[PDB]
Amino acid sequence: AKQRVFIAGHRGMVGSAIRRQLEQRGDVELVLRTRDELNLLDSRAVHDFFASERIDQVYLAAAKVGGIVANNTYPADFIYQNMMIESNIIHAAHQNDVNKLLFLGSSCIYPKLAKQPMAESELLQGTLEPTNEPYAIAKIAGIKLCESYNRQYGRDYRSVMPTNLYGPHDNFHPSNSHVIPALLRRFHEATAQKAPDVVVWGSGTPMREFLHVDDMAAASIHVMELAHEVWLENTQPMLSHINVGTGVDCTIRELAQTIAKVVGYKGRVVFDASKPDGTPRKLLDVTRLHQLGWYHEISLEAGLASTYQWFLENQ
């Protein structure tokens, strides 16, 4: 009997990445519902789905996600919708004897002034970035729902905290606040237009971390499928999440120059240092994941190149 695996949010960036890998697995039967078929905000509908579809495992990749403008403009929508989706799925899963779930956090969940690189223990150690506060609180509440169900009911609801992601199915619009898809699109257009330069705000000095979504999906399946005793040995019940990333930083400068090369731009990348930089360094400590035997396979250069080719095929 193949395991029946529900990938919530399977048309999303991360959900689709997990689907492309599991779609290859003869030991897995995927159960998929679009938003039109199942509105994850509707408690009744979510319970009815779990009460009729005989699910074994859930990948919780459904969420209301956006960039800086969206998070500051629709804060109520970000906190409410994520709290409801998470609560409805985790509670319905439990009520229907679904023992295995993988929840997705976000690195934006860590305190603004966290110690770098950020180990899992940085969670809740200080105040949040205001732009992401509503979203972050709902994501932290999701982790704590999983841990609470694990502790009270002996569930196996695991969680992963990705770093910045990029890859197929992203939003490739020049005004995206997420730097990889924005820069890919900006450099693509500047290359098409023969623009003499592309100006990036800031000095280029801050160090950040990036992981291709197919690596994220692989790590998530890896973490989901570890035997429970191994997962327990490398986590704590009230500190259960696992950072997923490279553990390696690169300057914004390096990233922009690499994107320029990947797209074949021959103008100048220019940084405007009159605009402020964020903190000097932000990256995850991925010791737990590496101790668990998973290491990322996609280098930045290779991942940016394949991402750009996906964009070119999907304009």
Considering the rule CB under 8 A, would residue 154 count as an interface residue with a copy of itself?
Answer: no
Q: Which residues pair with 28 in a beta bridge?
A: 3
Distance (Å, whole) CA 306 – CA 299: 11
Distance (Å, whole) CA 57 – CA 173: 34
Of 59, 74, 110, 135, the active-site residue reads: 135
Following CA atoms 178, 61, 218, 121 in sequence, which dihedral angle do they give, to the nearest 10 degrees?
Answer: 80
Least spacing, CB of residue 212 vs a copy of itself, in Å = 31
Our answer to whether residue 110 is catalytic in this structure is: no
* Contact indicator for 242, 161 with CB cutoff of 8 Å: yes
For residue 275, the tally of other CB atoms under 10 A from its CB is 11
Least spacing, CB of residue 287 vs ligand NAP, in Å = 18
180: left (phi > 0), else alpha (psi -120 to 50), else beta? alpha
**How many chain residues interact with a copy of itself (CB under 8 A)?**
38
Considering the rule CB under 6 A, would residue 107 count as an interface residue with ligand NAP?
Answer: yes
Considering the rule CB under 8 A, would residue 141 count as an interface residue with a copy of itself?
Answer: yes
> For ligand NAP, which is the closer residue by CB, 191 or 251?
251
CA 156 to chain centre: 20
In the list 41, 114, 119, 250, the residue contacting ligand NAP (rule: CB under 6 A) is: 41
37 assigned to a ligand binding site: yes
Q: Which residues pair with 164 in a beta bridge?
A: 210
Considering the rule CB under 6 A, would residue 292 count as an interface residue with ligand NAP?
Answer: no
Helix (H) or strand (E) segment spanning residue 52 = helix 43-53
> For a copy of itself, which is the closer residue by CB, 16 or 116?
116
Binding mask 100-129 for a copy of itself (x = CB under 8 A): ------------------------xxxxx-
* Contact indicator for 200, 269 with CB cutoff of 8 Å: yes
AA identity, residue 274:
S
Give the interface with ligand NAP as residue ranges (CB under 6 A). Answer: 9, 11-15, 35, 39-41, 61-65, 85, 104-107, 162-165
Enumerate the known binding-site residues for NADP(+): 9-15, 35-40, 104-107, 139, 162-165, 178
Q: Indicate the annotated binding residues.
A: 9-15, 35-40, 104-107, 139, 162-165, 178, 186, 201, 208, 277
